[PDB]
Amino acid sequence: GAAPAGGEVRRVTMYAERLAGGQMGYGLEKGKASIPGPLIELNEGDTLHVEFENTMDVPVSLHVHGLDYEISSDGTKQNKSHVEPGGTRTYTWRTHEPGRRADGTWRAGSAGYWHYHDHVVGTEFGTGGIRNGLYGPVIVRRKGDVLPDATHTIVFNDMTINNRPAHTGPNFEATVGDRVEIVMITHGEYYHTFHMHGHRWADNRTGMLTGPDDPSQVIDNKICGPADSFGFQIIAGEGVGAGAWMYHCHVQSHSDMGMVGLFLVKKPDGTIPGY
Amino acid sequence: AGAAPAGGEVRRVTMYAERLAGGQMGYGLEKGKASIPGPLIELNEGDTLHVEFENTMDVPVSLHVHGLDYEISSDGTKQNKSHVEPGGTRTYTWRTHEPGRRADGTWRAGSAGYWHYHDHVVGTEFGTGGIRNGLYGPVIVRRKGDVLPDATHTIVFNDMTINNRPAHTGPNFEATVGDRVEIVMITHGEYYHTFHMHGHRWADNRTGMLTGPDDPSQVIDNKICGPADSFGFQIIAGEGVGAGAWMYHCHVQSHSDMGMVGLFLVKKPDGTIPGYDP
């Protein structure tokens, strides 16, 4: 389980659809929109052509963080790269490996925990579409990056997690020992502090120290604001064992009002103690 | 300088939750000795700590810890039946570990860092009322080799207060030029803050100081922080700037205007402070 060298041109169809009760979501297939939208992952060097269709009765767009795009795939009304109702457009995202420039400085690669979202619904900064649920995670991996057993996306969108009703999680299940990858994105109006019980991570690209010389901070509590994105991998229950491990925003009124879910770590027989 | 040793001791300490003057509540290591912030707990990586906990209050209370190892039975949440009924007792166990290699080739981070414990049960199932009342405290886990300070001070931005104190009442912390001073900085509650120190700066990393010339960590004097963030650092008091009454404060402008200010009082060897009135 280690990511390869990138460099493939790949193609994906994507759709924007209305969901129940005023919401809106991205999907890989019509009738399959989700909140958050589909996970996209790539290897540094890959190119991705998103053959995008707006099935909605209002204009919509797709704007991505981190990845390379020319201005024609900005996905903004300002640069006239939104999609009209019933319309179709191909968005192109590219990625690159790190390397030394001609001027001698080091050019950072595209790898990271990134995300895409709408930019034109409600306002010309996508305020309505993001509130409605038009956001999704993008993982760009670097060659040799350790691959996880599972990937789970947690989005703090105003006072919700993934636009869900308060105090309804979501929960994620794992088994003690699993290598679990979390992708953490924030949207909207408020700052938050994402906290996990039982587990901790490095505040750097991959969430893991690169070895004994990495001076990165090891934390279990990270402040974050609109359009911030980070990720990390942990070994479930490592050093702490099985249980219902809570994650939540640590802003006191936010947890109290429902920004909480469970990381359910099972013992090899499936049981979870005290839960 | 003096350095932390390797860890591995199994330790035991009694702790109590007591009601304090003015609606407050605090932790302490001996009866009648609770404080806000609670007592500084110091461990070397690999140490174990058994907290024999006693709740002397009329409300359930708990003890939850950041960053350290613990099993689900020491979660300190009502959700996993780990709170302490009024008058009750419970042994909370925290463990730590050193960094090292896993079979998968990845590096496992250690427990070292600037952590903190708080209540999870008073007021709400997230300790909102308990934190407000003052049930928080710092925990430092040291890695083998860490430089040891001449003194450690704990600054906690709890909502609009520093350490639950009234506006414009510090706390003030005294040192002499040349002292190696360790700040532990915790934030709690509802609001974001930015911690700023006049005349001093630190590295935004684990220890607060650069490991050497190849360390790319940013050097700052202003750090945004939100509820349950904890970071720490060590500075040489007055290094390159001299003695005097050096302000620390939140840099959110209405927060400093309203009293989130204290004084780092750096003295000359003779104990005086140039241009300052006690």
Added chain:
Amino acid sequence: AGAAPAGGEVRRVTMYAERLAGGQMGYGLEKGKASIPGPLIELNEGDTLHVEFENTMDVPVSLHVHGLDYEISSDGTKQNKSHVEPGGTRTYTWRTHEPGRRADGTWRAGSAGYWHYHDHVVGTEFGTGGIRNGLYGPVIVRRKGDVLPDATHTIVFNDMTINNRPAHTGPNFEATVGDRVEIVMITHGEYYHTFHMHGHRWADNRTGMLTGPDDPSQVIDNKICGPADSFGFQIIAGEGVGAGAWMYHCHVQSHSDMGMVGLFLVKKPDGTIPGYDP
């Protein structure tokens, strides 16, 4: 083009505080040419700056700097008798230093970084009124060997404004594809912000560039920031993405909706911007 030299020279500038139209206030290096942000001040580690300061206004004002070394007499605070009366003058003295090894074996962090200065006295004793009015500016301290830019631009999030400008009025900055553009980014006031740049990214470290393949610093295009935070980076204009009208904005949704947006206009060599249609 080129690289920062080793610092060490003693320097002089005159700085003025002036009233500006619309109730604003600004600093400048020459009378009648105050600006918001204030004039950019550049030093190399080890340089000393003597600022002969004149307050041309009818209320007290001060000059306080982040990051740099100063004695308590150059704190710029009323609290330490370091403000300037109406009509008065005062020499503020800033020092900087190189990184190095201390006697007790630890590494002293240098002064290099993206810093800033601002008033501490107009409105409140934390300069709440001066900062609102526009009394802030950038200070760069470079390390020996730092790459130098083609151009430097200062972007200041001051409450719900950029550089005290009306909503949706920029500023816009122009480059040519391939230009090495430095950004100095400073936040002031009451609110937290998230600084976002379309089509470009940087490392969240001191220089904003990874020191090499061993640098673990995060790469981002969105940084949370709060009052008195300062960071900076250098980017290659259009690098890997080309020409266009690339927006930068605050990504807090209502903040962008209500004005906190500008444009990084990157031009082809012939000077055109494809599909720029204002």
